[PDB]
Structures are given as C-alpha cells and as structure tokens.
C-alpha cells in the first residue's frame, strides 16, 4: 500500500529536521532527494512560510508529493493581525466562544477564498459556497466577521 504522510515545512527550508527528518526518513525514501526536490517547487514564496504537503510513498520507496496552499487558519490569523504569542506564531483565541482576536472583513474573505481556489482539487467548488466555508471556521478561532 502507498502510505501518505502529512508534514508542515517552511517555504524554502527543506532539510533533515524534526518536521521533515522523522516524518519520512524512517520509511526509507531518500529524504535528501526529496529535500532538494521540494526547493524547486517552492522558489517564489517568502522563506519560512508554512506549506502543507501530502507525500505519497508508493511501494519500492518512490515518492511523489503534491504541494498545497497554506493552512486556512494560518491565513485567517495572518490577515486578522493577531498578536504573536508562544513560538513566535500568531496564536488564536483559547476560547472562541467569548474571546475575540481580530475582525476580518468580508473583502479579506473574498481573497482568502481566491487563493484557495487555485488548487485543481478545489478549483471546481463554487466561490459563492467557498467563502462561507472559511467564515464557518472564523467562529472556531475567535475571529469576528465584519460585513
């Protein structure tokens, strides 16, 4: 069976490390080869940007990975101008019900959806129904939605 792995890595930071090393180094595939192959995929994004990846490890240890857009939560907080907390990354509300971190307007939601429609696997979903999927997640991270 061709197992898959989920790993969040930096934009141009591909090397043996906690996020990259143990995730795939143990299965057998050549991590170095993948590390040097990921840089070619991400050469136009700001260094350090988080980039989800779904690396499929076929039998015989022949890997093929599809780079994905940044997490919606990371974009909502990045666009919500939230105060940086532990770890140096913008943290979300500990209690989304009461606490409120940012006030993201709908015009920001219309863009966060356009950047997420670039994916072919998500290019078919209508944009009218896609902007409400992220608005449904702003209620879970403590961000208010402003008309």
């Amino acid at each position: 069976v061709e197992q898959v792995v989920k790993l969040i890595v930096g934009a141009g930071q591909a090397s043996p490390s906690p996020p990259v090393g143990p995730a795939l180094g143990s299965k057998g595939i050549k991590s170095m080869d993948f590390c040097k192959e990921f840089n070619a995929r991400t050469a136009h994004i700001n260094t350090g940007t988080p980039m989800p990846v779904r690396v499929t490890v076929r039998p015989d240890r022949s890997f093929h990975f599809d780079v994905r857009t940044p997490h919606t939560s990371w974009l909502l907080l990045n666009a919500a101008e939230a105060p940086i907390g532990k770890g140096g990354k913008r943290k979300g509300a500990s209690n989304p019900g009461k606490e409120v971190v940012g006030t993201v307007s709908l015009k920001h939601v219309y863009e966060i959806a356009k950047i997420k429609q670039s994916e072919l696997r998500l290019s078919g979903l209508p944009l009218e129904g896609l902007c409400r999927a992220v608005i449904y997640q702003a209620r879970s991270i403590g961000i208010n939605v402003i008309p």
Binding site: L120, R121, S123, G124
Partner: protein
C-alpha cells in the same frame, strides 16, 4: 383546539410514511422527471469521493465555456450529475406515466376549526397513485410498449443521472465529450488546454462511467440516437433550414 379529524394542509393522507427518506426521495424524482426535458442515464461502478469531485469539476469547467450572450437565463449551474436510487427512481416513472391526477374525486376536509372543506388528493405519494401504478403494471406486455417499458431495463443496478434544465445541444457537446467521448463527433478536450482532464484521479473515474441511455421529452433514446441530437448545432437553427425550403 385541533380536532382529531383535522389533518395538516401540507401533509395529506399519504400511501406510506412521509418522514422516511424512501418516500421523501420519491417526491423529488417525480418532479425532476417533469422539470427536466433532457436527461442522460449513466452507470457508476464504485466511484470514490475524490473521483466524483474530479468528474464534477470538469463538467463545471467544460460547461462554463458555452457561449450564451443572448441574455438568456444563466443555465450553467443547475446541471448536476446526481446519483439516484434506482429502485425508487423506477417507481417515479410509473407514477409519472400510469397515473392521471384528474381522476380523483374531491372530498370534504376538516380544518383546525372543524369546518368541512372540499379537498382533492393528487399528490404523487397518495394512495390513489399507489393503486393506479400497481393495477396498471399488471399487464406485462402492454407495459413494454410504453416509454417506461423502454426504460425499465436501463434502471438496473447503480445509475447516475445527468439533468439539463433545457434541451441545449451546445450544453450537450460540452457534457457529452467529458463523459462519453467519441471522436470526431464529440472529441475529448485537448491536453495543452485542459490538463486537469487527463489526471490520475479524473482519468480513473471516467473509466467507470458508462452512458447507458438517455430520456428526452418523455421519449426513450438509445446511445447512438443521442449523438444525432448532440450533432445539431441548435434547435432554433434547425427549424430555420426547413423554412428556407
């Protein structure tokens, strides 16, 4: 207070339970067989979720490249590839064909006040419809002559149905080449322009879909016949050619 004999106005006596999804889904197809002039019947073979999404991603893309600058209604999103219940969908044809709603006698109905008001039960889920379809189906040979008989063998196993709100041959070429390509009549999209079509997920899903048959204006049609309809550039243009003669 509400009396015992009173029944809600939007819930007349049904032949079988209405809360269940078996009957609630029957009310859908019956209205879909009336509002959809053009309908294509496919056969799906254990298509996965990702495959389904990919298949429906090409239709939207292929259907979005149809020129409609005549200020006509935006018929580009009501076209859906919907998986249906073949068993309950086979009954829909019966109720839509072997049932005359004009053969019901109105009867008094009691409201919350208890006043008797004449009412007629013509809903598809009525006991009268159930009785008609059953008795009508008793004659085996006479049914084969009907449109239902020409489409009963097609409603076997799993079937996915494509619904088009109108008979637009242009929309057919956009949807008939993405599901059942047959060049040079309906050639598949090019790779240098539609790379998503020739994807691992999409390509592996289109191999499990087979266009079994089609239904147009309540008329059974064979796969070869669908090409003729799709071959026509437009209906209004076809009529003009006859006038020139």
């Amino acid at each position: 207070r509400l009396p015992d004999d009173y029944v809600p106005p939007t819930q007349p006596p049904s032949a079988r339970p209405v809360d269940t999804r078996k009957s609630q889904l029957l009310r859908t197809y019956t209205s879909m067989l009336r509002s959809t002039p053009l309908m294509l019947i496919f056969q799906h073979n254990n298509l996965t979720a990702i495959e389904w999404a990919a298949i429906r991603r090409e239709l939207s893309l292929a259907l979005s490249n149809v020129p409609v600058p005549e200020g006509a209604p935006d018929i580009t999103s009501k076209i859906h590839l919907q998986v249906v219940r073949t068993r309950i969908f086979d009954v829909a044809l019966k109720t839509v064909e072997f049932f005359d709603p004009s053969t019901v006698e109105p009867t008094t109905a009691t409201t919350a006040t208890g006043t008797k008001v004449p009412a007629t039960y013509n809903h598809d889920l009525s006991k009268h419809a159930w009785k008609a379809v059953k008795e009508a189906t008793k004659n085996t040979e006479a049914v084969e002559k009907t449109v239902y008989g020409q489409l009963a063998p097609l409603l076997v196993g799993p079937v996915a149905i494509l619904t088009l709100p109108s008979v637009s041959p242009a929309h057919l070429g956009a949807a008939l080449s993405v599901l059942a390509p047959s060049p040079p009549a309906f050639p598949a999209p090019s790779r240098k322009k539609n790379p998503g079509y020739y994807d691992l997920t999409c390509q592996s899903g289109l191999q499990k879909l087979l266009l079994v048959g089609g239904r147009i204006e309540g008329k059974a049609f064979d796969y070869d016949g669908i090409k003729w309809v799709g071959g026509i550039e437009n209906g209004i243009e076809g009529l003009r050619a006859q006038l020139v003669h």
